[PDB]
């Protein structure tokens, strides 16, 4: 009846931005990144990578509601260093270690299947 | 300020499962690779069932349900198929779907088992996985029949659980809880893990405050729809693709702000 | 224009008319079962 | 082809005044037409007029009288006047001689574009733009564009 | 009624196990021996056959209404 269709977890629509940047006004150098149609399987890795910068003062994410598919990643970085730069470095660092991990997994398969 | 270098050590590789150890990565990376095993790996599963005729004791939606959950051999086709809703075809084509046909009438006094073998593909690579016996779809009395045409399409585990390639993804870090994330009331009663390395005198490892979760032990058992290593390769490729599309939208939004 | 009904206990099929008393021809069994429709059905396998 | 307006209630007949101005005597078993109380008409001076409007007749056979609009036609208007004792006050003039003082319904369709692509349903409601489709598979009726539908 | 195709928790394909499970019961094994002879290690996959009732064999006794 009121069952949301199964493609509401990941498909966007016309007039939905995937990412929305809203500059926080409470503290200096902080942004809320609203990711639409994602879940913990993106924001948890981004949160853990943003905790590895020595220049991020706050790195968190929450879902507002588990029935509505969006997360908010709040980033507060050190001044002189934009939080958008920390975010676009976190994504590149994840792509770096995942491509390295995929190549090492390939090499481990070639080791295992060929003795 | 950068990503640590993970490493993989595979303990076994069977046609059912793969058991491996990922060292020198964070916890959230490891949990996400588990969650992308469960959800974000795309396989091929039946999603469009047209019942031409049915006389069986099971009703139509029960048979279409049971045809949903049958695993299909999608080891190399699912990288070639487009998602059905993304294709520019006239609503079905061999680039986003695999046709199956079932046509069974029972003309004998024995109970005839419509199994997974009676699903006949037009694509010779995408066939049902069933040494092992076939997957029982419906039994038939004499006189009953069922004819149907079923299109299978690419999808992943968030959409529906019939696109889930994994039977089971066991995942554990720190099997003697030196980290003390879990706090046992009486650790003598607790059985040791498979990956424990303490002697039987000792219950759990001594606490270290400076430690962090590393050396994540995985046991990925496939259901048969994929080989258990191409689940892991497809998962890593899908997670890197999700992150890359998030970065592209991020670049668009930053260029929109400036 | 005639509707085909399945003859209950007999399991055979027969025509029927408007304003026709409902009877089988084999044994006059009173319960008819209407045949499955000819238009298409399509199920999402979810 | 021609409407009428009852001007006298009798025992077995009605006295009915049509758009032609011809008082006729017809049986009880004429049909009741749905009246358009929001219908628009134009006078001789291109001003918008409606029902219950006091209009002067400047041309035609009734030129000089002034009556209230009670019913409307494509090109005719019926005028009531309590001073005029004929026909209960009713007459008719042409409106240009006055001055103010779906197919897709119930058709098995197949969504051929979008997120619901490949679903068979039956169109419940339909517009120029969108159409509501009773889906055969789910327990839910959803609306899609007509450009996304393809009939069987 | 009929055997589920997947174990509800895991998704392990258990629908192909039922007739072989009946064969291993009638070949004088215990139920616990028959389950891990079919290779069901997790107990959530063991309840799927251990507590199935094959009710469709009762439903096939009745003559089919349509013919
Ligand atoms: Zn296509
Ligand atoms: Zn008969
Ligand atoms: Zn299970």
Curated annotation (Swiss-Prot), chain D:
Q: Which residues carry this modification: N6-acetyllysine?
A: 117
Per the record, the domain of life is Eukaryota
Task: List ligand-binding residues for DNA.
Answer: 74
Task: Enumerate the subcellular locations listed in this protein's record, separating them with semicolons.
Answer: Nucleus
Mutation effect (residue 32 to A): Reduces the affinity for Pol II elongation complex
Q: Which residues bind RNA?
A: 34
How is this chain modified after translation? Methylated by PRMT1/HRMT1L2 and PRMT5/SKB1. Methylation negatively regulates interaction with P-TEFb and RNA polymerase II. Phosphorylated by CDK7 and CDK9. Phosphorylation by P-TEFb (CDK9) at Thr residues of the C-terminal repeats alleviates transcriptional pausing and promotes transcription elongation. Dephosphorylated by the INTAC complex when transcripts are unfavorably configured for transcriptional elongation, leading to premature transcription termination: dephosphorylation is mediated by the PPP2CA component of the INTAC complex. Dephosphorylated by the PNUTS-PP1 complex in termination zones downstream of poly(A) sites, thereby promoting deceleration of RNA polymerase II transcription.
What outcome is documented for mutating residue 33 to E in this protein?
Reduces the affinity for Pol II elongation complex
- Tissue expression from the record: Ubiquitously expressed.
All copies of the KOW domain together span 49-82, 103-136
Q: Which family does it belong to?
A: Belongs to the SPT5 family.
Q: How does it assemble?
A: Interacts with SUPT4H1 to form DSIF. DSIF interacts with the positive transcription elongation factor b complex (P-TEFb complex), which is composed of CDK9 and cyclin-T (CCNT1 or CCNT2). DSIF interacts with RNA polymerase II (Pol II); forms DNA and RNA clamps that stabilize Pol II elongation complex while maintaining the nontemplate DNA strand in the transcription bubble and nascent RNA in the exit channel. This interaction is reduced by phosphorylation of the C-terminal domain (CTD) of POLR2A by P-TEFb.
Q: What does this protein do?
A: Component of the DRB sensitivity-inducing factor complex (DSIF complex), which regulates mRNA processing and transcription elongation by RNA polymerase II. DSIF positively regulates mRNA capping by stimulating the mRNA guanylyltransferase activity of RNGTT/CAP1A. DSIF also acts cooperatively with the negative elongation factor complex (NELF complex) to enhance transcriptional pausing at sites proximal to the promoter. Transcriptional pausing may facilitate the assembly of an elongation competent RNA polymerase II complex.
- What this protein is called in its record is Transcription elongation factor SPT5
Tell me what organism the protein belongs to. Answer: Homo sapiens
């Amino acid at each position: 009846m009121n069952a949301p269709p199964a493609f509401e977890s990941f498909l966007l629509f016309e007039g939905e931005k995937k990412i929305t940047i809203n500059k926080d006004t409470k503290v200096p150098n902080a942004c809320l990144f609203t990711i639409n149609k994602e879940d913990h399987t993106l924001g948890n890795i981004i949160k853990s990578q943003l905790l590895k910068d020595p220049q991020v003062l706050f790195a968190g994410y929450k879902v507002p509601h588990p029935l509505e598919h969006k997360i908010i990643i709040r980033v507060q970085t050190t001044p002189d260093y934009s939080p958008q730069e920390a975010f676009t470095n976190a994504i590149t660092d994840l792509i770096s270690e995942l491509s390295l991990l995929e190549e090492r997994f390939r090499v481990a398969i070639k080791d295992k299947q060929e003795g | 300020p950068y990503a640590n270098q993970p490493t993989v050590r595979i303990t076994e590789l069977t046609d059912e499962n793969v058991k491996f150890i990922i060292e020198n990565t964070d916890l959230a990376v490891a949990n996400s690779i588990r969650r992308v095993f469960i959800a974000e790996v795309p396989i091929i599963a039946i999603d469009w069932v047209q019942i031409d005729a049915n006389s069986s004791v099971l009703h139509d939606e029960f048979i279409a349900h049971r045809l949903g959950l049958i695993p299909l051999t999608s080891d190399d086709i699912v990288d070639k198929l487009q998602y059905s809703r993304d294709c520019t075809c006239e609503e079905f084509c061999p680039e986003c779907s695999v046709e199956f046909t079932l046509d069974v009438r029972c003309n004998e006094d024995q109970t005839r088992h419509v199994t997974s073998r009676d699903l006949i593909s037009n694509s010779p690579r995408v066939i049902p996985v069933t040494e092992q016996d076939d997957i029982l779809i419906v039994k038939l009395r004499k006189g009953q029949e069922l004819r149907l045409r079923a299109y299978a399409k690419k999808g992943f585990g968030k959409e529906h659980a019939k696109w889930n390639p994994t039977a089971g993804v066991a995942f554990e870090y720190d099997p003697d809880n030196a980290l003390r994330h879990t706090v046992y009331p009486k650790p003598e009663e607790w059985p040791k893990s498979e990956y424990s390395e303490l002697d039987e005198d000792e219950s759990q490892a001594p606490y270290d405050p400076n430690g962090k979760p590393e050396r994540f032990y995985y046991n990925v058992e496939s259901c048969g729809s994929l080989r258990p290593e191409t689940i892991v390769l497809s998962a890593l490729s899908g997670l890197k693709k999700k992150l890359s599309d998030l970065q592209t939208q991020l670049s668009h939004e930053i260029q929109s702000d400036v | 224009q005639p509707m085909i009904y399945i003859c209950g206990e007999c399991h055979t099929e027969n025509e029927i008319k408007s304003r026709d008393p409902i009877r089988c021809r084999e044994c006059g069994y009173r319960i008819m079962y209407k045949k499955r429709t000819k238009r298409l059905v399509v199920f999402d396998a979810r | 082809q021609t409407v009428g307006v009852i001007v006298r209630l009798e025992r077995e007949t009605f006295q009915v005044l049509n758009m032609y101005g011809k008082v006729v005597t017809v049986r009880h078993q004429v049909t009741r037409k749905k009246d358009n109380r929001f219908a628009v008409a134009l006078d001789s001076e291109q001003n918008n007029i409606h029902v219950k409007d006091i209009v002067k007749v400047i041309d035609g056979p009734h030129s000089g009288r002034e009556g209230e609009i009670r019913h409307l036609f494509r090109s005719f208007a019926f005028l009531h006047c309590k001073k005029l004792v004929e026909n209960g006050g009713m007459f008719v003039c042409k409106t240009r001689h006055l001055v103010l003082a779906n197919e897709l319904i119930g058709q098995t369709v197949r969504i051929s574009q979008g997120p619901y692509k490949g679903y068979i349903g039956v169109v419940k409601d339909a517009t120029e733009s969108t159409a509501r489709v009773e889906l055969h598979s789910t327990c839910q009726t959803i609306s899609v564009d007509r450009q996304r539908l393809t009939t069987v | 009624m009929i055997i589920p195709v997947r174990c509800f928790t895991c998704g392990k394909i258990v629908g192909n196990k039922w007739e072989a499970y009946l064969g291993l019961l009638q070949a004088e094994y215990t139920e616990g021996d028959a389950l891990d002879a079919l290779g069901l290690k997790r107990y959530c996959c063991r309840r799927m056959l251990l507590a199935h009732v094959d009710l469709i064999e009762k439903l096939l006794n009745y003559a089919p209404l349509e013919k």
